[PDB]
């Protein structure tokens, strides 16, 4: 059991270091707030 537990945390260290697609839920939070503030400052160039 202790050999399967120590080899299971080692498989998380290579999956988190190879690709960055596992944190897709946290990336959509920052990208949505950066898109809302960029659209607000771009509407000052309009004439209305």
């Amino acid at each position: 059991i202790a050999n399967q537990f120590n080899s299971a945390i080692g498989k998380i260290q290579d999956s988190l270091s190879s690709t960055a697609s596992a944190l897709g839920k946290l990336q959509n939070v920052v990208n949505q707030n950066a898109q809302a503030l960029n659209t607000l400052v771009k509407q000052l160039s309009s004439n209305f």
């Binding site: 960029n38 400052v41 771009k42 000052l44 160039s45």
Partner: protein, 48 residues
């Protein structure tokens, strides 16, 4: 320099400090703008 004031460079009116520029520029460019469509650099009509 070193004081934020209201400048009038042939109609380009704003309010902010005037520091020296340290980027590349063109001899046929009068002003520079950012993504937010605000004036970032001002050409001097008299001096270079």
């Amino acid at each position: 320099k070193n004081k934020c004031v209201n400048f009038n460079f042939n109609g380009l009116t704003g309010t902010g400090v005037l520091t020296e520029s340290n980027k590349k520029f063109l001899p046929f460019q009068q002003f520079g703008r950012d993504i937010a469509d605000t004036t970032d650099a001002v050409r001097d009509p008299q001096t270079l």
